[PDB]
Design an enzyme around this catalytic site. Structure first.
Site, PDB file in Angstrom:
ATOM      1  N   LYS A   1      49.293 -18.240 -12.145  1.00  0.00           N
ATOM      2  CA  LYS A   1      50.562 -17.717 -12.618  1.00  0.00           C
ATOM      3  C   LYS A   1      50.337 -17.073 -13.961  1.00  0.00           C
ATOM      4  CE  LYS A   1      54.637 -19.481 -11.595  1.00  0.00           C
ATOM      5  NZ  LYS A   1      55.741 -20.457 -11.763  1.00  0.00           N
TER       6      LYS A   1
ATOM      7  N   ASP B   1      67.422 -23.100 -11.782  1.00  0.00           N
ATOM      8  CA  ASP B   1      67.160 -21.954 -10.875  1.00  0.00           C
ATOM      9  C   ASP B   1      66.756 -22.456  -9.486  1.00  0.00           C
ATOM     10  OD1 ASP B   1      66.997 -19.331 -12.696  1.00  0.00           O
ATOM     11  OD2 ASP B   1      66.154 -21.042 -13.824  1.00  0.00           O
TER      12      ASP B   1
END
Ligand code: ANP
Ligand code: NA
EC number: 2.7.11.1
Lengths: 286, 280
Positions: B110, B199
């Site tokens: 990431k 989220d």
């Protein structure tokens, strides 16, 4: 330079020295504070700052020293704003943003404004940096949105983690239990989501806590910490989530529902991010 | 890349900590070549690893490609990453790639991308990655379904590659009720540990071959102590209910309530962040 005399005092100098050391140190040793302050009088100043809860002493298995407290950071920002004649007095805490505390402040003339003190970060080093960046971002976006005729408070000033802005004469939607025409307020909130999207933005936290309703039932947006670009691969979900949150509020609070709500496909791009980045760079230079 | 090119690239990074635009004289002073720093700078610009900028000030900045190279060169030196193989997806503020070490073991990489100015981009991207590594460590040690964290450098996080697909790409599941229950139980477990995802959705929940969920992105978690924690908790619950109804035509009256929460991950994560800030 008479207006800057309070910034020259020893307590302000030592407080600034603690802030300076906090850029690379989680806990600032007294020897480093003394070296940075370059006032001796240091220890006496440190003891008064501790007494006034502006700094806190911290012991680790390998280091000892001081950290600026929230009251200490507030003090630096508020004294800087006082020197500019922006803030003379701080009143009651009126509310909260996602990552900030909101207060009513008054200038020397007695005119009232809103003060937002940003508080972000779970370590001393990231708290110092993130709180400042969160306030900088808010001022830059508020300026960029206000210039595009968005319903946001007029931005007045900025320092560190502090933002001074126009005080809206109204209440957050969460504190309102009766409205003359729920349909008009719902349409106004939905139109704000649409206008933002047409300008390349998705609020991300669109709700009853950050929307202020004035005496004419007009909405002002007062907190927008984590906006999403309409270019994000998952922008549609973020857009729909904001629409849905307001639909849930109108059903729960006013028993109002409508089948007339915005769709992400209906957005038509009219740049805010470019203007906000330009303002952030101007502020970072100073 | 030559050792001098890498020394200059690191000097640009170093100068970027306090300068929006890094002057060449400062890069040369930091790099301490012993020279030809100007020739290296011009090749670094040509290769788009750094860019020239000119307003009162003039100089250089690292590009995303240059920052990626620094993080990937470090991870390669540690034998963590040998090859990178294109983007598999996106997090809210990161790009996700499949990577392989020397022995061909695959991991997920990431690369965090945050900030709209050079100074804040360098700092925020590094902090976003550090926060993810610290929370993934704190959650993984508490048996939460998160990838195992492997390594970290700059804006890069290396982690376990989950053999699965995001819930958004799944159109058929054997038992929607079990997956729904597993997603709701995750929201509850997080809240009992003092956290709200913020989220929680079909884009960051990966479904494996046994229909088990892994959470792969959590950039903006909210504390259950936040004055508006209940709204954040309810929003996460509602997003899951919305997806399960839309995708699987599955609904249930058995969903979590914020009052049902029986209260540390933040303390562990802050401790790991301070350890990483010390070595930065
Ligand atoms: N962030 C904000 N920016 C500008 N004005 C604000 C903001 N939040 C509240 N106000 C104004 O603050 C004034 C007095 O606020 P106060 O009632 O004491 O606290 P509050 O209930 O949290 N805020 P509010 O309900 O909006 O009045 C009102 O005229 C409000 O519209
Ligand atoms: Na503008």
């Amino acid at each position: 330079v008479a207006k800057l005399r309070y910034m020259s005092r020893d307590d302000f100098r030592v407080l600034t020295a603690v802030e300076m050391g906090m850029k690379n140190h989680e806990i600032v040793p007294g020897s480093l504070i003394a070296s940075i302050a370059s006032l001796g009088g240091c220890n006496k100043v440190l003891r008064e700052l501790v007494k006034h809860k502006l700094i806190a002493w911290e012991r680790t298995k390998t280091v000892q020293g001081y950290r600026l407290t929230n009251a200490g950071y507030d003090y630096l920002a508020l004294k800087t704003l006082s020197s500019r004649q922006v803030v003379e007095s701080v009143g009651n805490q009126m509310g909260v943003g996602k990552e900030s505390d909101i207060y009513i402040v008054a200038n020397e003339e007695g005119q009232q404004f809103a003060l937002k003190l940003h508080r972000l970060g779970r370590t001393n080093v990231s708290w110092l940096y993130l709180s400042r960046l969160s306030a900088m971002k808010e001022f830059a976006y508020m300026k960029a949105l206000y210039e595009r005729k968005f319903p946001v408070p007029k931005p007045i000033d900025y320092n560190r983690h502090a933002v001074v802005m126009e005080l809206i004469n109204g209440y957050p939607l969460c504190q309102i239990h009766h409205v003359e025409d729920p349909a008009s307020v719902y349409d106004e909130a939905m139109e704000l989501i649409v206008k933002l999207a047409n300008h390349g933005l998705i609020h991300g936290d669109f709700n009853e806590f950050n929307l202020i309703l004035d005496e004419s039932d007009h909405i002002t947006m007062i907190d927008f910490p984590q906006m999403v670009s309409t270019s994000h691969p998952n922008a549609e979900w973020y857009f729909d989530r904001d629409v849905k949150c307001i639909k849930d509020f109108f059903m729960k609070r006013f028993s109002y529902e409508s089948e007339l709500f915005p769709t992400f496909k209906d957005i038509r791009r009219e740049d805010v991010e470019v203007s906000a980045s330009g303002y952030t760079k101007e502020m970072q230079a100073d």
